[PDB]
Amino acid sequence: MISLIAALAVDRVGGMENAMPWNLPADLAWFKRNTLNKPVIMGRHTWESIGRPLPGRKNIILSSQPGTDDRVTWVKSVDEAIAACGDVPEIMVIGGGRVYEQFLPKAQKLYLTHIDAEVEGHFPDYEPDDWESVFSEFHDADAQNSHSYCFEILERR
Ligand SMILES: Nc1nc(=O)c2nc(CNc3ccc(C(=O)N[C@@H](CCC(=O)O)C(=O)O)cc3)cnc2[nH]1
Numbered sequence: 722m723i724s725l726i727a728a729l730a731v732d733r734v735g736g737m738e739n740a741m742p743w744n745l746p747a748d749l750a751w752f753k754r755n756t757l758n759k760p761v762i763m764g765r766h767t768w769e770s771i772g773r774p775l776p777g778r779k780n781i782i783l784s785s786q787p788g789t790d791d792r793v794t795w796v797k798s799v800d801e802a803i804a805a806c807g808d809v810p811e812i813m814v815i816g817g818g819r820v821y822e823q824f825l826p827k828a829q830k831l832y833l834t835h836i837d838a839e840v841e842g843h844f845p846d847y848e849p850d851d852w853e854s855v856f857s858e859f860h861d862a863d864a865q866n867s868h869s870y871c872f873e874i875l876e877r878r
Pocket residue numbers: 726727728746748749750751752753767770771775776815816833834
């Protein structure tokens with residue numbers, strides 16, 4: 722099965738630019754916990770932004786061009802990315818926007834972090850009627866985390 726994992730802020734005319742609006746180590750810990758020992762699929766730009774393989778996961782990068790780093794697995798289509806994962810329980814698609822769009826119709830589960838920051842203007846719109854919330858938990862900002870956030874897991878209805 723295919724899952725998407727992403728961090729989401731509120732869309733708002735007059736909000737911050739999307740360059741770097743939050744700092745959430747707690748969110749990266751949730752990301753790690755829910756991706757470890759699963760294959761992760763990402764687009765080339767997301768790969769270049771992370772800048773190093775995610776340890777303890779099979780890293781699969783989508784690019785139309787040949788690969789340029791032997792530390793990861795390179796694929797040229799969505800179907801090839803899925804086939805590269807083999808027979809596993811859960812494939813994690815980690816971004817970015819173009820990649821989420823292509824995989825959302827295939828996905829059974831969404832792991833979402835709803836961050837209480839307003840940004841003017843990555844994740845596709847999803848029909849709330851087609852998804853059922855199965856886990857959610859709110860957390861206050863703290864000394865290490867700039868904003869409050871809510872983890873949520875949605876499964877197809
Ligand atoms: N919830 C969510 N949060 C994100 O920040 C996120 N980011 C991406 C793309 N960007 C990134 C950037 C850096 C790392 C990263 O360094 N992760 C380390 C964790 C740090 C820790 O807790 O020690 C890793 O091992 O996963 C991951 C994803 C995709 N979906 C997301 N999903």
